[PDB]
Design an enzyme around this catalytic site. Structure first.
Site, PDB file in Angstrom:
ATOM      1  N   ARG A 183       0.852  -1.185   0.000  1.00 13.98           N
ATOM      2  CA  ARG A 183       0.000   0.000   0.000  1.00 13.98           C
ATOM      3  C   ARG A 183       0.894   1.242   0.000  1.00 13.98           C
ATOM      4  NH1 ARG A 183      -4.859  -0.678   4.147  1.00 13.98           N
ATOM      5  NH2 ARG A 183      -5.914   0.218   2.308  1.00 13.98           N
ATOM      6  N   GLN A 196       4.151   2.564   2.519  1.00 16.32           N
ATOM      7  CA  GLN A 196       4.770   1.401   3.155  1.00 16.32           C
ATOM      8  C   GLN A 196       6.229   1.085   2.735  1.00 16.32           C
ATOM      9  OE1 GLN A 196       1.797  -1.804   2.899  1.00 16.32           O
ATOM     10  NE2 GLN A 196       1.238  -1.395   5.058  1.00 16.32           N
ATOM     11  N   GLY A 213      -6.055   2.593  10.011  1.00 18.30           N
ATOM     12  CA  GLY A 213      -6.452   1.572   9.061  1.00 18.30           C
ATOM     13  C   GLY A 213      -5.651   1.620   7.773  1.00 18.30           C
ATOM     14  N   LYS A 248      -0.069   1.210   9.015  1.00 13.95           N
ATOM     15  CA  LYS A 248       1.082   1.717   9.768  1.00 13.95           C
ATOM     16  C   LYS A 248       1.911   0.641  10.473  1.00 13.95           C
ATOM     17  CE  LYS A 248      -0.560   4.966  12.391  1.00 13.95           C
ATOM     18  NZ  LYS A 248      -1.935   5.327  11.878  1.00 13.95           N
ATOM     19  N   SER A 249       1.246  -0.180  11.281  1.00 17.04           N
ATOM     20  CA  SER A 249       1.952  -1.147  12.120  1.00 17.04           C
ATOM     21  C   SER A 249       2.903  -2.093  11.348  1.00 17.04           C
ATOM     22  CB  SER A 249       0.952  -1.953  12.935  1.00 17.04           C
ATOM     23  OG  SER A 249       0.151  -2.701  12.051  1.00 17.04           O
ATOM     24  N   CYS A 301     -18.355  20.589  -4.194  1.00 13.29           N
ATOM     25  CA  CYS A 301     -17.962  19.198  -3.927  1.00 13.29           C
ATOM     26  C   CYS A 301     -17.665  18.953  -2.426  1.00 13.29           C
ATOM     27  CB  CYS A 301     -16.715  18.870  -4.746  1.00 13.29           C
ATOM     28  SG  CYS A 301     -16.220  17.134  -4.731  1.00 13.29           S
ATOM     29  N   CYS A 305     -12.933  14.010  -7.511  1.00 13.37           N
ATOM     30  CA  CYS A 305     -14.091  13.326  -6.898  1.00 13.37           C
ATOM     31  C   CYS A 305     -14.674  12.209  -7.808  1.00 13.37           C
ATOM     32  CB  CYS A 305     -15.168  14.339  -6.438  1.00 13.37           C
ATOM     33  SG  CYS A 305     -16.517  13.663  -5.394  1.00 13.37           S
ATOM     34  N   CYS A 308     -19.965  12.338  -4.653  1.00 14.74           N
ATOM     35  CA  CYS A 308     -20.724  12.979  -3.569  1.00 14.74           C
ATOM     36  C   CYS A 308     -22.096  13.435  -4.092  1.00 14.74           C
ATOM     37  CB  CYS A 308     -19.957  14.155  -2.959  1.00 14.74           C
ATOM     38  SG  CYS A 308     -19.843  15.632  -4.018  1.00 14.74           S
ATOM     39  N   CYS A 351     -22.044  16.667  -6.414  1.00 16.53           N
ATOM     40  CA  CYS A 351     -21.442  16.435  -7.739  1.00 16.53           C
ATOM     41  C   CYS A 351     -22.392  15.649  -8.691  1.00 16.53           C
ATOM     42  CB  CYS A 351     -20.049  15.752  -7.638  1.00 16.53           C
ATOM     43  SG  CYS A 351     -18.539  16.800  -7.157  1.00 16.53           S
TER      44      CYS A 351
HETATM   45 ZN    ZN Z   1     -17.884  15.561  -5.281  1.00 20.15          ZN
END
Ligand code: ZN
Ligand code: ZN
Lengths: 530, 530
Positions: free
Chosen positions: B30, B33, B53, B56-57, B390, B408, B412, B415
């Site tokens: 990812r 990393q 999430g 990191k670890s 947006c 985007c 959303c 949008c």
């Molecule tokens: Zn948007």
DNA sequence: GGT
DNA sequence: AGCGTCGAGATCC
DNA sequence: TGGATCTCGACGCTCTCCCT
DNA sequence: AGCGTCGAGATC
DNA sequence: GATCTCGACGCTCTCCCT
């Protein structure tokens, strides 16, 4: 930031003010900054006051509380601190009280009553910060009082706790912005003995204030005499010396002696007691009874001397303390200033004497190993003890950044009374010899404490650790000690800590500035008497 | 810059690729990393800022397997440690931890395995008081360091080092001792939240120099963002929630966030009565209750958890398909972190927020003692009032990030809209409200928000109406939105009052209002075209 | 409980 | 761990 | 073969401020 | 304290 | 015949260990 501008007595209120000082508080004139502060509050403005403990701060709010009508609100961080003042107040015929985390459903109910009550005799209420943050009942009471105009002034004690840097943080303090927001028509005053200018200007934001006066008093105590002496090698000798002063020049008079540990504090005490001296011990692991009794007999003069750790400090106000003696040095310059400052609160001459010893450097070093600037602050204090020619007042003013004029001492420290002359001794070759010793030790896979290094130098100690061709000079042991201390704070040498099952210990090693000796024309000098 | 570090031509690269696929069962990396792992294996110092999430670890857990012996990990909370041991165990990797509540048998075995020359042990977790207060623990690290069984250190929640941390834990201020006593080990700091101020503070405290700093982006491309109108009637609100949960979300896991502890329980009872499988979560249940719920949700025996902010930490469910907000959050930072628990598997997921007038004032009163509470609330109110920008653009204004506007990609609500807009002039409505407020004060009366809307509309108590004012012909929800507008623009303002059981808000005339004295002044608001 |  | 004491033996004048 | 002084193990005692 | 409900008592 | 105005009477009253 100009107090003098406020040094008159042609304000309407000036009359009742002069009246109240002499008639109610029994006083003749004002100490410094007192008048300029009181004027500013009666003119309805905002002000901060920075002045040393015992300087006359509380009078600055206690008095105007008597010129208006109704009460003044006071915020204070500790219960003991509140009790001290109520007592003094009670003794002059003035009604005031304090609410608290441990009051009774009856008491609590009586204070709520006296606030709304428009015919009450109350003049001052003392509370804690959690009281402002966590009590809708209390806040709804202040609201009503403010609307009847029974309450128009607020004072905040220990104001340096607002900002993060103050080195005393108390979270409840951040809430106090709610005071100007909800009662904008009341005036506010903040009080403290300790503040950086960054710290002050911050709290002016937290409290939601603008704009703001700032008056600052001087550190200087003209009646105190400052001295540093050599600490004797043998404990039985050191205790004798102290007895000669107590039965000698200080006979009949009250004093305090400050120690390093809890155990030192008990053993000194036992020793004076065994020679007819009237002394008692004070530290944090004693029962609260013992503490309260010792503090009581000393105030009544049934006890001559208190032997204490830094636990004995907060809230001390006895006027006639004639001597303060330091059994070991303090851990920082700020600590020494505040400890010695307990002598001579009556403005009469008094003495401050500090005993310096090599082995105390290393005791304090290990104790402060987890503070990030602990070693730095210790070495500042060590510099002050090493100095034999500058005025003591000049060295202190370098730490507080006050603007000192050189000859204002008037022969009130030891170095200003000396008759001698001086010269700089060259000690470069002694440094090259010590480094030889350290270098041999590492090849052999051995580590040296300070004691072991002085022994090898002098030709004594375990034999394998000596170096062929080195000759220890013909000086006393105390002079050799002072030389090593010099190389250490200049960083030609350094400390190396080790962690064991019951102790943190210091070793000596080659320091970072030792690379300078690569120039064979480099020189190290130290000052001596002729 | 990280760019320069994104390769695979260093001596270690092989065993690394080996370990990822064979031990941790993964294909590729990812973002950030790889660049981080390289820098640690190159023996340097680095800070990593990345959302919970994000991955990191793995950045310390992995290199702990390429050298020989253990890595030391410092972590603030017991629960947080347990989470990770569970994962490592399921992988076949040995590790352990030490605590305030450990058995003397265990403590012994650990001190043993640290020095023990053939130990399988690989990672060791502790709290910050183990470093500051244990004499035996520190003497153990000292021996391990000298045998070279220990060469890397990681520090979690690194932001706690600092006063500005907004999470301060004092024991952190002792961690400078790590680089001082173990100068040859490398260090890595971890956090999801940091000002560039807060970071430079911590790099001093930890006694470091010099220092890499990598920062990941806030953006989550798989999440869809929407805002809806909250229905006045509560029997009606419960219905829509159910249409969604039986409708598009049938069979899918989700979370619903509430304002109070009491809201939490009612909502739950209302779903259960209509066949939904739901359970409540807040700080005021037994420790047992809590666990039994969290357990059934993870196993899918429960579809929905209805919770306060108490339910957040430790959460790692990959397949959360929806997050619904029953009331708004108290700040923008809070909403981001709450909604961000959806879609940790990278697959599409939805975030829907219900907006209501009366919630503004509920939150206002609750945050009255926080110095910037009202400010942070009004930012969150602005975001709900907007019908054209947006959602990703409005968020990036808060985090000072460098957004390019067409990224985007129709994810959303604003949008996806098809409409056009215009600026409605509302100046005269402002002049009318002020008339009402002005009459009220002459009469010595205070108005809540409810009372002001009633007088406008010609309803409510009669003496409070004003002759000649005509409430428009528009729905109530439009009148509400207009008043909110005058409030943040500061034509009106809030005025708090304290009572025996509650803090309440009133409305009054605000500063920017003076400007209504120029006959050339105009206030406009944006609306959709017919 | 500090080769 | 560091450091003070006690005694036997090995070096000095 | 006298009287003083060095040197080195074996052994027993001891081990740190303040509620902020 | 604020807000909602209910029923007598004057005006649509 | 159906909407309006006013007391009196009862119920309720707020996020996380930091
Ligand atoms: Zn948007
Ligand atoms: Zn002088």
């Amino acid at each position: 930031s100009s107090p003098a501008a406020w040094n008159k007595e042609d304000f309407p209120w000036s009359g009742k003010v002069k009246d109240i000082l002499q008639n109610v508080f029994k006083l003749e004139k004002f100490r410094p900054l007192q008048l300029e502060t009181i004027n500013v509050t009666m003119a309805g403005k905002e002000v901060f006051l920075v002045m040393p403990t015992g300087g006359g701060k509380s009078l600055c709010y206690q008095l105007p509380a008597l010129c208006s009508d109704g009460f003044t609100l006071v915020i204070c961080p500790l219960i003991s601190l509140m009790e001290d003042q109520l007592m003094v107040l009670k003794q002059l015929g003035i009604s005031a009280t304090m609410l608290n985390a441990s009051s009774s459903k009856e008491h609590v109910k009586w204070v709520h009553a006296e606030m709304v009550n428009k015919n009450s005799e109350l003049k001052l209420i003392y509370v804690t910060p959690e009281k402002i943050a966590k009590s809708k009942m209390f806040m709804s009471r202040l609201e009503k009082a403010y609307e009847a105009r029974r309450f128009t002034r607020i004072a905040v004690d220990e104001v340096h706790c607002c900002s993060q840097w103050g080195h005393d943080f108390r979270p409840d303090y951040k809430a106090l912005g709610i005071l100007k927001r909800q009662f904008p028509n009341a005036s506010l005053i903040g009080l403290t003995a300790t503040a950086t200018n960054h710290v002050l200007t911050d709290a002016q934001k937290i409290l939601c204030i603008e704009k703001c006066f700032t008056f600052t008093a001087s550190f200087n105590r003209p009646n105190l005499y400052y001295e540093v002496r050599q600490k004797p090698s043998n404990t039985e000798d050191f205790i004798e010396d102290i007895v000669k002063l107590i039965n000698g020049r200080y006979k009949g008079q009250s004093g305090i002696i400050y120690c390093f540990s809890q155990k030192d504090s008990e053993q000194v005490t036992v020793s004076l007691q065994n020679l007819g001296i009237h002394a008692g011990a004070y530290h944090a692991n004693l029962e609260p009874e013992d503490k309260t009794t010792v503090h009581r007999k000393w105030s009544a003069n049934e006890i001559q001397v208190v032997v204490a750790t830094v636990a004995f400090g907060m809230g001390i106000d006895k006027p006639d303390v004639r001597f303060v003696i330091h059994h070991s040095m303090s851990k920082s310059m700020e600590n020494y200033y505040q400890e010695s400052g307990r002598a001579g609160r009556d403005d009469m001459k008094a003495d401050c004497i500090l005993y310096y010893g090599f082995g105390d450097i290393f005791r304090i070093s290990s104790m402060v190993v987890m503070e990030n600037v602990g070693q730095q602050k210790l070495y500042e204090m060590v510099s002050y003890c090493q100095n034999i020619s500058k005025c003591r007042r000049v060295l202190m003013a370098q730490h507080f950044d006050e603007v000192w004029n050189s000859e204002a001492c008037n022969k009130m420290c030891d170095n200003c009374c000396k008759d001698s002359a001086f010269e700089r001794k060259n000690i470069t070759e002694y440094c090259r010899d010590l480094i030889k010793i350290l270098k041999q030790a590492e090849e052999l896979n051995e580590k040296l404490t300070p004691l072991k290094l002085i022994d090898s130098w002098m030709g004594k100690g375990a034999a394998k650790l000596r170096v062929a061709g080195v000759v220890a000079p013909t000086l006393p042991r105390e002079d050799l000690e002072k030389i090593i201390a010099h190389f250490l704070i200049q960083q030609y040498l350094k400390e190396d800590y080790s962690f064991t099952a019951y102790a943190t210990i210091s070793y000596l090693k080659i320091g970072p500035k030792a690379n300078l000796l690569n120039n064979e024309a480099h020189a190290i000098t130290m000052q001596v008497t002729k």
